[PDB]
């Protein structure tokens, strides 16, 4: 390896590379145009391929680190541009990429990307591909320029095959709007979750982090043995250390090099790994972190002997807390991958509570001899809450589910902005639609995947825009007891229903033309407003009110002269309504 992007270029291919390098210069010279861009990558591909020809070639030797920030600085309008960004380029290669770092926005001030038509689209992706694609490339690296390239770069590829696949079929928009739908989702739960985990290892530090590794580790892995999992663990606490840093080179190649390990050690590892190894340098670690669940050994001991039954646990423990506490997570975790990972952690948890009570009491075998007993209520707490919503999400529909949500929290937490309780209750539906397909034992951990982002989205908004002190006491409290504290909240007896607002229950003959999308945007604010407004009404006077107004909309969407139904009989149906609430 004479030449580092002579190599790199061999493993990545043209194509790649190319794709990866315009991500990369996109992600930090946010306000550059494509244009230049596209010249950058063209200066740096043929520089590469020089490379490739003759390992000895001027500058073929320096990093890629050098090279890249030895790139980024030849623009010229960087300083009228960028600014500061433009002082590292002063600084010694060292110090000089790290002060790039700094200075890389974190979601810029750059207008929302407004999807054109289907057709537009098509015809633009035939009369030139690339280009069409490439600038599309740009719009979104520029705009998550912590989002992993080669992650970003595996999305873009399945819009490619969309629009392959949708912009050759009769009726596109009834092909590729589905897709642009299903991606765009999946791209916006990969970047929180990626966001989410950076804020985990912030705030919470390492130590939680690794509990929650070992958990998930042990799951997916659970024919792996403890001394190999603790290996992982530290491993990928060091790469997310560093990926979350934001430094893709070093965050590539500590992802590569845990790939290489897992992959080699494979049969030490798991069976459900052969696809991912086979595959290439760039989808080999994305491969092995969506990996499935090996299947447990079937001839595994029970946690109560080396845990409760013995004698000799309390100097176990003594002897290295974290590492004894680790192995009880792994144990325990290996034996459940039907459990949420913070299920997982909870128990841990109790178990280290209950040890360093008892282990300082008298005769502690005895002392933690009933410690599963405790675990039980743990368990059942979310699996009850699991069987209860899916229960219902069963009987009424995604829409209805989301409405009877939408009851649920806005009278929870009144004081939360109507179309943020719309957006929450919606999403919460979709998990439910999500999750409630799956059989009992994918349920739990499906749920978490998806609370998880919500719940810390949630929190997100809270902060900038503070509403209630219980909202915040949740979400600044541990990852452990963030969900079951907001599944605590109770109804606010305090809140004073707001003021009776006619035009607020006005609505017009608009709403038979708008989307099923708007039509049940604009029927979910009413009813959450309705709630907002008398609060103290029952589930059977609410749904009383629903019907008659289900019946509003129908007979004035299908009647002579639409504007005067929705004027006259709207006049009658918010009478009869008040007073019947
Ligand atoms: C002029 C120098 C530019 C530097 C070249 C662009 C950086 C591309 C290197 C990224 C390689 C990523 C390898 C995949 C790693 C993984 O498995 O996650
Ligand atoms: C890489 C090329 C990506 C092209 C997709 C652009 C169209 C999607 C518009 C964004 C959206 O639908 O929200
Ligand atoms: C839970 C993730 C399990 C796979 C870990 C290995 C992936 C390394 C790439 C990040
Ligand atoms: C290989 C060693 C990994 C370390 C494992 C540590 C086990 C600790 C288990 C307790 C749960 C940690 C939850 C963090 C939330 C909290 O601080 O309460
Ligand atoms: C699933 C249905 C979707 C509806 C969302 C409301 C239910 C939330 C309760 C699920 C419990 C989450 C399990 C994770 C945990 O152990 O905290
Ligand atoms: C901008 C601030 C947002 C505040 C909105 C609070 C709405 C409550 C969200 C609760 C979702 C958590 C799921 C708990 C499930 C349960 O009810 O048990
Ligand atoms: C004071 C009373 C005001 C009464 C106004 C009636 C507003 C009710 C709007 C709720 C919307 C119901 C959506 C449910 C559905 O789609 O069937």
Redesign the pocket.
């Known amino acids: 390896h004479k030449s580092e992007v002579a190599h790199r270029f061999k493993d990545l291919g043209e194509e790649n590379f190319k794709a990866l390098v315009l991500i990369a210069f996109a992600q930090y010279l946010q306000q550059c145009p494509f244009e230049d861009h596209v010249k950058l990558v063209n200066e740096v591909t043929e520089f590469a391929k020089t490379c490739v020809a003759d390992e000895s070639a001027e500058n073929c030797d320096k990093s890629l680190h050098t090279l890249f920030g030895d790139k980024l600085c030849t623009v010229a309008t960087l300083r009228e541009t960028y600014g500061e960004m433009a002082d590292c380029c002063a600084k010694q290669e060292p110090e000089r990429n790290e002060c790039f770092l700094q200075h890389k926005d974190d979601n810029p001030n750059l207008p929302r990307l407004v999807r054109p038509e289907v057709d537009v689209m098509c015809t633009a992706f035939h009369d030139n591909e690339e280009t069409f694609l490439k600038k599309y490339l740009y719009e979104i690296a520029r705009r998550h320029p912590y989002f992993y390239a080669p992650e970003l770069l595996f999305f873009a590829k399945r819009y490619k095959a969309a629009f392959t696949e949708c912009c050759q079929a009769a009726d596109k928009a009834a092909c590729l709007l589905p897709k642009l739908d299903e991606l765009r989702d999946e791209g916006k739960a990969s970047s929180a979750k990626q966001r989410l985990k950076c804020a985990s290892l912030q705030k919470f530090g390492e130590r939680a982090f690794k509990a929650w590794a070992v958990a998930r580790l042990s799951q997916r892995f659970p024919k792996a043995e403890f001394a190999e999992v603790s290996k992982l663990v530290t491993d990928l606490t060091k790469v997310h250390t560093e990926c979350c840093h934001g430094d893709l080179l070093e965050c590539a190649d500590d992802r590569a090099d845990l790939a290489k390990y897992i992959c080699e050690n494979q049969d030490s590892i798991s069976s459900k790994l052969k696809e991912c190894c086979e595959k290439p340098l760039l989808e080999k670690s994305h491969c092995i972190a969506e990996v499935e669940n090996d299947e447990m050994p079937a001839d595994l001991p029970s946690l109560a002997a080396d845990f409760v039954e013995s004698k000799d646990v309390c100097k176990n423990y003594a002897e290295a807390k974290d590492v004894f506490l680790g192995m009880f997570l792994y144990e325990y975790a290996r034996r459940h991958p039907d459990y949420s990972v913070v299920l997982l952690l909870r128990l841990a948890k109790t178990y280290e509570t209950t040890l360093e009570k008892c282990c300082a009491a008298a005769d502690p075998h005895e002392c933690y001899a009933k410690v599963f007993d405790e675990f039980k209520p743990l368990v059942e707490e979310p699996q009850n809450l699991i069987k209860q919503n899916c229960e219902l999400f069963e009987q009424l529909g995604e829409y209805k589910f989301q ?1 009877a949500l939408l009851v649920r929290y806005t009278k929870k937490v009144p004081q939360v902005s109507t179309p943020t309780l719309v957006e929450v209750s919606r999403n919460l539906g979709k998990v439910g639609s999500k999750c409630c397909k799956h059989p009992e034992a994918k349920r739990m951990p499906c749920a978490e995947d998806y609370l998880s982002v919500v719940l810390n989205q949630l929190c997100v908004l809270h902060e900038k825009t503070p509403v209630s002190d219980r909202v915040t006491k949740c979400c600044t409290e541990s990852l452990v007891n963030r969900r079951p504290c907001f599944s605590a909240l109770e109804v606010d007896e305090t809140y004073v229903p707001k003021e ?1 607002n006619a035009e607020t ?1 006005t609505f017009h003959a608009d709403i038979c033309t708008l989307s099923e999308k708007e039509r049940q945007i604009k ?2 604010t ?2 959450v407003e ?1 709630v907002k ?2 609060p103290k009404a029952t589930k059977e006077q609410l749904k009383a ?2 019907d008659d ?2 019946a509003f909309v129908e007979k004035c969407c299908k009647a002579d002269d639409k504007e005067t139904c929705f004027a006259e009989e709207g006049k009658k ?2 009478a009869a ?2 007073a019947a ?1």
Do not use: E
């Open positions: 409405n009776f229950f029927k979910q009413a009813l309705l407004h008398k009110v629903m107004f289900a149906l918010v309504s008040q609430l």
